[PDB]
Amino acid sequence: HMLSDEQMQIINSLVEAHHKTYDDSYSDFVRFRPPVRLSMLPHLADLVSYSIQKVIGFAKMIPGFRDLTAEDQIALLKSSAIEIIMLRSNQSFSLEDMSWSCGGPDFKYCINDVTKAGHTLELLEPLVKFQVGLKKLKLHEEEHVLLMAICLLSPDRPGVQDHVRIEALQDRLCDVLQAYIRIQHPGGRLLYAKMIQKLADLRSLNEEHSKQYRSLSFQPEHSMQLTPLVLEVFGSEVS
Protein backbone atom coordinates (compact mmCIF):
# COMPACT_ATOMS: atom_id res chain seq x y z
CA HIS A 1 0.00 0.00 0.00
CA MET A 2 0.95 3.68 -0.24
CA LEU A 3 0.07 7.03 1.35
CA SER A 4 -1.97 9.58 -0.60
CA ASP A 5 -1.32 13.26 -1.26
CA GLU A 6 -3.95 14.44 1.23
CA GLN A 7 -2.44 12.31 4.00
CA MET A 8 1.11 13.39 3.15
CA GLN A 9 0.02 17.04 3.02
CA ILE A 10 -1.45 16.70 6.51
CA ILE A 11 1.91 15.31 7.63
CA ASN A 12 3.82 18.15 5.94
CA SER A 13 1.87 20.94 7.65
CA LEU A 14 1.96 19.04 10.94
CA VAL A 15 5.74 18.59 10.89
CA GLU A 16 6.09 22.23 9.84
CA ALA A 17 3.92 23.41 12.75
CA HIS A 18 6.09 21.53 15.24
CA HIS A 19 9.29 23.03 13.82
CA LYS A 20 7.88 26.54 14.22
CA THR A 21 6.64 25.93 17.77
CA TYR A 22 9.60 23.96 19.18
CA ASP A 23 13.05 25.51 19.61
CA ASP A 24 15.76 22.87 20.00
CA SER A 25 18.19 25.62 21.08
CA TYR A 26 16.15 26.29 24.26
CA SER A 27 17.63 29.80 24.16
CA ASP A 28 14.39 31.40 25.39
CA PHE A 29 14.82 29.64 28.76
CA VAL A 30 17.27 32.36 29.81
CA ARG A 31 14.30 34.78 29.97
CA PHE A 32 12.43 32.69 32.56
CA ARG A 33 12.73 33.26 36.26
CA PRO A 34 15.91 31.32 37.14
CA PRO A 35 15.73 27.90 38.80
CA VAL A 36 16.72 27.68 42.47
CA ARG A 37 17.96 24.42 44.00
CA LEU A 38 8.99 25.76 46.37
CA SER A 39 12.11 27.30 44.84
CA MET A 40 11.64 25.63 41.44
CA LEU A 41 8.02 26.77 41.03
CA PRO A 42 8.87 30.22 39.55
CA HIS A 43 11.08 28.69 36.86
CA LEU A 44 8.71 25.75 36.36
CA ALA A 45 5.69 28.03 35.96
CA ASP A 46 7.48 30.20 33.40
CA LEU A 47 8.58 27.05 31.56
CA VAL A 48 5.00 25.73 31.39
CA SER A 49 3.50 29.12 30.50
CA TYR A 50 5.98 29.38 27.63
CA SER A 51 5.12 25.84 26.45
CA ILE A 52 1.38 26.60 26.55
CA GLN A 53 1.98 29.36 24.01
CA LYS A 54 3.78 26.86 21.79
CA VAL A 55 0.90 24.37 22.07
CA ILE A 56 -1.55 27.12 21.10
CA GLY A 57 0.74 27.97 18.19
CA PHE A 58 0.98 24.31 17.23
CA ALA A 59 -2.79 23.85 17.58
CA LYS A 60 -3.64 26.81 15.33
CA MET A 61 -1.69 25.19 12.48
CA ILE A 62 -3.39 21.78 12.69
CA PRO A 63 -5.75 21.39 9.70
CA GLY A 64 -9.34 22.06 10.69
CA PHE A 65 -8.59 23.15 14.25
CA ARG A 66 -8.68 26.84 13.27
CA ASP A 67 -12.15 26.39 11.76
CA LEU A 68 -13.69 25.08 14.99
CA THR A 69 -15.69 27.44 17.17
CA ALA A 70 -13.61 29.43 19.64
CA GLU A 71 -15.37 27.59 22.46
CA ASP A 72 -14.29 24.20 21.10
CA GLN A 73 -10.73 25.48 20.68
CA ILE A 74 -10.67 26.66 24.30
CA ALA A 75 -12.16 23.44 25.68
CA LEU A 76 -9.69 21.31 23.71
CA LEU A 77 -6.69 23.42 24.74
CA LYS A 78 -7.75 23.66 28.39
CA SER A 79 -8.00 19.88 28.80
CA SER A 80 -5.21 18.74 26.44
CA ALA A 81 -2.48 21.34 27.03
CA ILE A 82 -1.01 19.46 29.99
CA GLU A 83 -0.93 16.21 27.97
CA ILE A 84 0.63 17.86 24.91
CA ILE A 85 3.25 19.46 27.16
CA MET A 86 4.07 16.01 28.56
CA LEU A 87 4.10 14.67 25.00
CA ARG A 88 6.44 17.34 23.63
CA SER A 89 8.78 17.16 26.63
CA ASN A 90 9.85 13.69 25.45
CA GLN A 91 12.01 15.53 22.89
CA SER A 92 14.20 16.77 25.77
CA PHE A 93 13.91 13.68 27.98
CA SER A 94 17.14 11.67 28.13
CA LEU A 95 17.16 7.98 28.99
CA GLU A 96 20.80 8.31 30.07
CA ASP A 97 20.10 11.11 32.57
CA MET A 98 16.52 10.05 33.44
CA SER A 99 15.64 13.74 33.22
CA TRP A 100 14.72 16.59 30.90
CA SER A 101 17.85 18.22 29.45
CA CYS A 102 17.32 21.53 27.69
CA GLY A 103 20.50 22.95 26.25
CA GLY A 104 22.44 24.09 29.27
CA PRO A 105 23.17 22.49 32.65
CA ASP A 106 20.95 24.95 34.54
CA PHE A 107 17.94 23.86 32.45
CA LYS A 108 18.34 20.18 33.43
CA TYR A 109 15.37 19.14 35.54
CA CYS A 110 15.99 15.88 37.34
CA ILE A 111 13.80 14.21 39.96
CA ASN A 112 15.21 15.31 43.24
CA ASP A 113 13.79 18.75 42.73
CA VAL A 114 10.20 17.57 42.23
CA THR A 115 9.41 18.60 45.81
CA LYS A 116 10.84 22.05 45.05
CA ALA A 117 8.44 22.42 42.09
CA GLY A 118 5.27 21.70 44.08
CA HIS A 119 4.53 18.15 42.91
CA THR A 120 4.74 14.68 44.44
CA LEU A 121 6.04 11.36 43.14
CA GLU A 122 2.46 10.19 42.55
CA LEU A 123 2.79 12.28 39.37
CA LEU A 124 6.54 12.07 38.74
CA GLU A 125 6.86 8.29 39.08
CA PRO A 126 4.17 7.53 36.44
CA LEU A 127 5.39 10.41 34.26
CA VAL A 128 9.00 9.21 34.16
CA LYS A 129 7.72 5.70 33.38
CA PHE A 130 5.57 7.25 30.65
CA GLN A 131 8.55 9.20 29.28
CA VAL A 132 10.82 6.15 29.08
CA GLY A 133 8.19 4.00 27.35
CA LEU A 134 7.54 6.75 24.82
CA LYS A 135 11.30 7.15 24.35
CA LYS A 136 11.67 3.40 23.72
CA LEU A 137 9.08 3.63 20.93
CA LYS A 138 11.66 5.55 18.84
CA LEU A 139 8.90 7.53 17.17
CA HIS A 140 9.58 9.16 13.84
CA GLU A 141 9.21 12.93 13.69
CA GLU A 142 6.00 12.36 11.72
CA GLU A 143 4.65 9.92 14.33
CA HIS A 144 5.47 12.11 17.33
CA VAL A 145 3.68 15.02 15.66
CA LEU A 146 0.57 13.03 14.69
CA LEU A 147 0.27 11.78 18.28
CA MET A 148 0.21 15.37 19.57
CA ALA A 149 -2.45 16.32 17.01
CA ILE A 150 -4.53 13.22 17.74
CA CYS A 151 -4.23 13.99 21.46
CA LEU A 152 -5.43 17.58 21.00
CA LEU A 153 -8.35 16.65 18.73
CA SER A 154 -9.84 14.29 21.31
CA PRO A 155 -13.63 14.79 21.38
CA ASP A 156 -14.04 13.09 24.78
CA ARG A 157 -12.86 16.16 26.68
CA PRO A 158 -15.07 18.18 29.06
CA GLY A 159 -16.32 21.29 27.31
CA VAL A 160 -16.38 20.45 23.60
CA GLN A 161 -19.70 20.98 21.82
CA ASP A 162 -19.31 20.08 18.12
CA HIS A 163 -18.35 16.52 19.02
CA VAL A 164 -18.96 15.08 15.54
CA ARG A 165 -16.75 17.57 13.69
CA ILE A 166 -13.81 17.16 16.09
CA GLU A 167 -14.09 13.37 15.94
CA ALA A 168 -13.95 13.38 12.13
CA LEU A 169 -10.71 15.37 12.26
CA GLN A 170 -9.20 12.98 14.80
CA ASP A 171 -10.09 9.87 12.79
CA ARG A 172 -8.52 11.37 9.67
CA LEU A 173 -5.33 11.91 11.70
CA CYS A 174 -5.54 8.36 13.05
CA ASP A 175 -5.83 6.86 9.56
CA VAL A 176 -2.78 8.90 8.55
CA LEU A 177 -0.86 7.57 11.55
CA GLN A 178 -1.94 4.00 10.76
CA ALA A 179 -1.06 4.36 7.08
CA TYR A 180 2.26 6.05 7.88
CA ILE A 181 3.43 3.27 10.20
CA ARG A 182 2.47 0.46 7.83
CA ILE A 183 4.12 2.05 4.80
CA GLN A 184 7.01 4.06 6.29
CA HIS A 185 7.88 2.37 9.60
CA PRO A 186 9.74 -0.97 9.40
CA GLY A 187 8.72 -3.22 12.26
CA GLY A 188 5.74 -1.01 13.03
CA ARG A 189 3.33 -3.93 13.16
CA LEU A 190 1.94 -3.03 16.60
CA LEU A 191 3.21 0.54 17.02
CA TYR A 192 -0.18 2.17 16.44
CA ALA A 193 -1.60 0.16 19.34
CA LYS A 194 1.25 1.14 21.67
CA MET A 195 0.90 4.79 20.63
CA ILE A 196 -2.83 4.80 21.41
CA GLN A 197 -2.10 3.28 24.82
CA LYS A 198 0.10 6.33 25.48
CA LEU A 199 -3.00 8.50 25.05
CA ALA A 200 -4.71 6.42 27.73
CA ASP A 201 -1.66 6.96 29.94
CA LEU A 202 -1.94 10.72 29.33
CA ARG A 203 -5.50 10.83 30.69
CA SER A 204 -4.20 9.22 33.89
CA LEU A 205 -1.29 11.68 34.05
CA ASN A 206 -3.67 14.55 33.26
CA GLU A 207 -5.89 13.53 36.18
CA GLU A 208 -3.01 13.25 38.66
CA HIS A 209 -1.43 16.60 37.77
CA SER A 210 -4.79 18.37 37.91
CA LYS A 211 -5.29 16.99 41.42
CA GLN A 212 -1.90 18.34 42.48
CA TYR A 213 -2.35 21.64 40.65
CA ARG A 214 -5.51 22.22 42.70
CA SER A 215 -3.41 22.13 45.88
CA LEU A 216 -1.10 24.79 44.45
CA SER A 217 -3.80 27.16 43.20
CA PHE A 218 -5.68 26.86 46.50
CA GLN A 219 -2.72 28.31 48.42
CA PRO A 220 -2.26 31.95 47.34
CA GLU A 221 1.38 31.97 48.45
CA HIS A 222 2.03 29.40 45.70
CA SER A 223 -0.50 30.41 43.05
CA MET A 224 0.98 33.93 43.01
CA GLN A 225 4.14 32.33 41.58
CA LEU A 226 2.11 31.08 38.60
CA THR A 227 1.50 33.08 35.45
CA PRO A 228 -1.81 34.56 34.25
CA LEU A 229 -1.77 32.19 31.27
CA VAL A 230 -1.20 29.11 33.45
CA LEU A 231 -4.04 30.24 35.72
CA GLU A 232 -6.25 30.69 32.65
CA VAL A 233 -5.47 27.36 30.95
CA PHE A 234 -5.11 25.10 34.00
CA GLY A 235 -8.05 26.88 35.65
CA SER A 236 -11.59 25.65 36.11
CA GLU A 237 -13.40 28.62 34.60
CA VAL A 238 -15.96 27.50 32.05
CA SER A 239 -16.92 29.05 28.71
Binding site: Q53, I56, I74, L77, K78, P228, L229, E237, S239
Partner: peptide, 10 residues
Protein backbone atom coordinates in the same frame (compact mmCIF):
# COMPACT_ATOMS: atom_id res chain seq x y z
CA UNK B 1 -13.53 35.45 30.13
CA UNK B 2 -10.63 33.48 28.64
CA UNK B 3 -8.92 36.77 27.92
CA UNK B 4 -5.43 35.54 27.05
CA UNK B 5 -6.64 32.40 25.26
CA UNK B 6 -8.92 34.40 22.95
CA UNK B 7 -6.09 36.80 22.16
CA UNK B 8 -3.54 34.04 21.56
CA UNK B 9 -5.95 32.37 19.12
CA UNK B 10 -6.13 35.65 17.17
Amino acid sequence: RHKILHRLLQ
